[PDB]
Ligand binder design. Structure first.
Ligand code: FAD
Ligand code: A2P
Length: 296
């Protein structure tokens, strides 16, 4: 029945009342000092106890108590590593995390709880994890699919997961031969997450992988508009629209809630030109498992 790799997935092997306790192996800042905000890539040991698949998330329970002396609520993070992991042994899990800093009502600076807990982690520290969680972002079973990936910021995470599996790994029962097209919206060049990895992939499979960046604060279109992901998509409108009409095309979107509207804004217009109501067409795609969304 499913078009996605849903068979034999694990879900919530570990729960908040009984998390798995893993350890921090590495924690590196992957954005430049220039960047507006910090994003870190961190890898934890799970010794094979968390049997996740590409596209799933884990929950993290930050250490400490809430204001009622209870344990903090879990926060969800998409896994940024493939099932084998960054070390190829299936015993680690990686996260891509933005440090959340804001000012409250009184002008006071407030640090987000889990994000600052995670970005401050030192190798050797323990971390409580739950999950795995999710079925929405699982990859398509079809190894010849056209997979379009639209992410903003940390929303690159699940796509890194997919792409490692597709392009950096050898699998007995899976060999990707379709077309993968990643669009990634970030603010600055010092914020182009995992670009070096994607450039290696592109070199390996030039015919199977397309890559486009939308560097919001550095790029403008012709009208001098800010290069958001939707802005960059428009430049390929005809192409993308054609792709959307095929049954073997799967769209995945991950990142800021905001991107979702912007993209709908472009599609409404593209479709209307062909006499199609985007709202119904999108509903049909969602039902056919071709339009997959995880924004937050
Ligand atoms: C499915 C899923 C996957 C996700 N994947 C990831 C991922 O891979 N990487 C990642 O970094 N995050 C991801 N997130 C977000 C993550 O779950 C946390 O929400 C994020 O790290 C912030 O949590 P925190 O505990 O640091 O902040 P909290 O202490 O929970 O602070 C959050 C609160 O900050 C406030 N806030 C935020 N900005 C402002 C502002 N400008 N002004 C006033 N208040 C503000 C709001 O009250 C908000 O609810 C994901 C979320 C979901 C649901
Ligand atoms: N509504 C939106 N639609 C598309 N991209 C967005 C939207 N809001 C913010 N962005 C961009 O998403 C990226 C988020 O990455 P990061 O977490 O590193 O900041 C940035 O380039 C940010 O642009 P900007 O901040 O210049 O408005």
């Amino acid at each position: 029945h499913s078009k996605k790799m849903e068979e034999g997935i694990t879900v919530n092997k570990f729960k908040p009342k009984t998390p798995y306790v893993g350890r921090c192996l590495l924690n590196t800042k992957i954005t430049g000092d220039d960047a507006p905000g910090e994003t870190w890539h961190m890898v934890f040991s799970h010794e094979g106890e968390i049997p996740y698949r590409e596209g799933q998330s884990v929950g993290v329970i930050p250490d400490g108590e809430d204001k009622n002396g209870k344990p903090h609520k879990l926060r969800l993070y998409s896994i940024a590593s493939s099932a084998l992991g960054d070390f190829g042994d299936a015993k680690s899990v990686s996260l891509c995390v933005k440090r959340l800093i804001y000012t409250n009502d009184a002008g006071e600076t407030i640090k987000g709880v889990c994000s600052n807990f995670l970005c401050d982690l030192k190798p050797g520290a323990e971390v409580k994890l739950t999950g795995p969680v999710g079925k929405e972002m699982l990859m398509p079973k079809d190894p010849n699919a056209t997979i379009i990936m639209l992410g903003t910021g940390t929303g690159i995470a699940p796509f890194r997961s997919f792409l490692w599996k597709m392009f950096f790994e050898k699998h007995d029962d899976y060999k990707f031969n379709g077309l993968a097209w990643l669009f990634l919206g970030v603010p600055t060049s010092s914020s182009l997450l995992y670009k070096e990895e994607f450039e290696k992939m592109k070199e390996k499979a030039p015919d199977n992988f397309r890559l486009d960046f939308a560097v919001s604060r550095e790029q403008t279109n012709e009208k001098g508009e800010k290069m958001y992901i939707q802005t960059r998509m428009a430049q390929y409108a005809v192409e993308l629209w054609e792709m959307l009409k095929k049954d073997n095309t799967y769209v995945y979107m991950c990142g800021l809630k905001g991107m979702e509207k912007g993209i709908d804004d472009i599609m409404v217009s593209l479709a209307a030109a062909e006499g199609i109501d985007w709202i119904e067409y999108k509903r049909q795609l969602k039902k056919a498992e071709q339009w997959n969304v995880e924004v937050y």
